[PDB]
Paper text:
Shewanella species produce hydroxamate-type siderophores and iron removal from these compounds can occur in the cytoplasm via Fe(III)–siderophore reduction mediated by siderophore-interacting proteins (SIPs). SIPs contain stably attached flavins and use NADH and/or NADPH as reducing agents.
The structure of SbSIP was determined at 1.9 Å resolution. The structure revealed two domains as previously described for other SIPs: a N-terminal or NAD(P)H binding domain and a C-terminal or FAD binding domain. The NAD(P)H binding domain consists of the typical β1–α1–β2 Rossmann fold architecture composed of a manifold of β-antiparallel-strands (β1–β6) and two short α-helices (α1 and ƞ1). The FAD isoalloxazine ring shows a planar conformation and is stabilized through aromatic stacking interactions with Tyr-60 and Tyr-225, and hydrogen bonds with residues Thr-61 (backbone O and N), Tyr-59 (side chain OH), Val-75 (backbone N), and Asp-73 (backbone O). The triad of basic amino acid residues (Lys-45, Lys-236, and Lys-239 reported in SIP from S. putrefaciens, SpSIP) and proposed to form the Fe(III)–siderophore binding pocket is well conserved (Lys-44, Lys-236, and Lys-239 in SbSIP). As previously observed for SpSIP, Lys-44 forms a ridge with Lys-236, making the access to the FAD cofactor smaller when compared to SfSIP. However, the pocket of SbSIP is substantially smaller when compared to SfSIP.
Author numbering:
A (entry chain B): 6 to 248
B (entry chain A): 4 to 246
Amino acid sequence: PRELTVIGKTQVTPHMLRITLGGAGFAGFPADQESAYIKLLFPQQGDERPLMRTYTIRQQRMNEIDVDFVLHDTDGPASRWAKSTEIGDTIQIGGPGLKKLINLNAEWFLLAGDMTALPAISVNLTQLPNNAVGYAVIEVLSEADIQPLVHPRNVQLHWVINPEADPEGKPLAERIAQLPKLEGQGAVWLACEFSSMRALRKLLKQTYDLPKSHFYTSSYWKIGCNEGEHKLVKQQDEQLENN
Amino acid sequence: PAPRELTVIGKTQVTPHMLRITLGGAGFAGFPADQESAYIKLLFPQQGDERPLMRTYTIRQQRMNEIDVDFVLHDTDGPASRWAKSTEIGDTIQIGGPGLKKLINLNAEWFLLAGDMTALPAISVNLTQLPNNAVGYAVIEVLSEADIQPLVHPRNVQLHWVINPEADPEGKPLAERIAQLPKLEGQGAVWLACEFSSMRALRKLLKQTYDLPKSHFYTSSYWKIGCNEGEHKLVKQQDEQLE
Ligand SMILES: Cc1cc2nc3c(=O)[nH]c(=O)nc-3n(C[C@H](O)[C@H](O)[C@H](O)COP(=O)(O)OP(=O)(O)OC[C@H]3O[C@@H](n4cnc5c(N)ncnc54)[C@H](O)[C@@H]3O)c2cc1C
Ligand SMILES: Cc1cc2nc3c(=O)[nH]c(=O)nc-3n(C[C@H](O)[C@H](O)[C@H](O)COP(=O)(O)OP(=O)(O)OC[C@H]3O[C@@H](n4cnc5c(N)ncnc54)[C@H](O)[C@@H]3O)c2cc1C
């Protein structure tokens, strides 16, 4: 696995901390992997297997990537590492995985997620055509966490300010259910906390009934679960769904 | 009662002359629940020692941590309509309220709602509170056919749209439409709000047609031609006393 060096830190917003990774270990990293996922490896005391955490490549340059960390409640190893790490420190990473961008063969676009998906949504918005139409709906912890995102003028940005994730999964789904319905062939991309993902998925299956080719949904974390516990819930739900 | 500072977190052009602004954030904490169709006051600060100007708007929709307010993009901009067009996500505004909501009386066999675009938000909310088997009319005066909206409503509450590009100082359009509707049989409830002169014409008509108790007969002037809201408040208070 690759060893990258911390060469910068940027407080993007109060709860979003961006780490730049590069150095000699970056050599050979595949080009143009923005929005692809990587795995951060955290060594464990007394265990040869690392703990692993999934993050998005927010930006990529010739010899560097940026990774954006939500400074979430209830630190885990990854959010602790992001706050504590110092320039010059190194971290092993695996990946990148396959990019899962929104389908561009569509007349309108609906993107939604919470702050764990804001990096990927940011990248997707830069890949939409300039004449694109639709919505990007993002749940953030505070108004200060709103970002000035690049986006097509007619893809309307909507921010939902929710200081604590809702186990009932309402805030994003309630906002989107109360937006006008989009007409034409659409593409949907959403990722957020597990319960909000299910609520959005249910709502959007009912509103638009889109094929899987144009309907990406993913749970990125779950309240009360560290990432290992989350992967199980997620696989069970994606199977129960697909079946 | 110190005003709440809310952040603009979304904008949606509902129709060409109806612009919906979503407001929320930390200033929303504690906001009373279930206040759709209640009024709020927007504050526009003035130069120097001057107290701010205040404008009255309706809570169109309410969610966990935000409200939507629908602005008519009316002829002859005032501070509120100019503000709605120019404001950007991230901007803030102070609000007062909510006031007491005045929903149509539900103890009735039929329902008649009427108003112009300043009343379309409250009428929309009222239509969602009626029982599904409700019978009657909702008659709305809009500036153009494009300002007609696909409102949720009981199937047997019939929507009627009056298309009038400029308000009538004699107050004829809504009244002439409603005077020619079949008369409803049974115990009724009426709710109407529009430009002052049309309000007077409708109140007179429906007092004569149905002569309902005040418990079941709501009328309100929401604005007046040639008057800013301060000038309007005086006329409205004088007319409410005469009654
Ligand atoms: C494909 C993919 C891409 C992702 N990209 C990013 C990214 O770019 N940036 C990012 O910040 N996250 C991203 N995530 C989410 C990230 O993997 C999880 O948030 C992970 O749980 C964080 O690891 P951790 O060590 O801090 O917490 P863990 O040890 O996994 O969990 C500790 C505790 O924190 C809670 N918790 C975890 N995440 C959050 C959160 N966001 N809000 C509130 N509580 C939380 C857990 O429920 C648990 O209680 C991505 C997830 C996936 C599946
Ligand atoms: C209880 C209540 C609820 C209301 N809810 C809403 C609401 O949800 N949405 C909404 O748009 N309005 C609503 N109104 C009406 C709103 O208060 C007035 O339209 C207000 O005058 C607009 O403020 P302004 O600063 O733009 O104009 P002002 O500075 O008050 O007036 C400027 C000029 O514009 C004219 N004008 C004002 N409104 C209109 C109009 N609708 N059409 C044409 N000319 C107009 C005035 O006559 C004046 O010449 C409500 C009124 C009341 C009493």
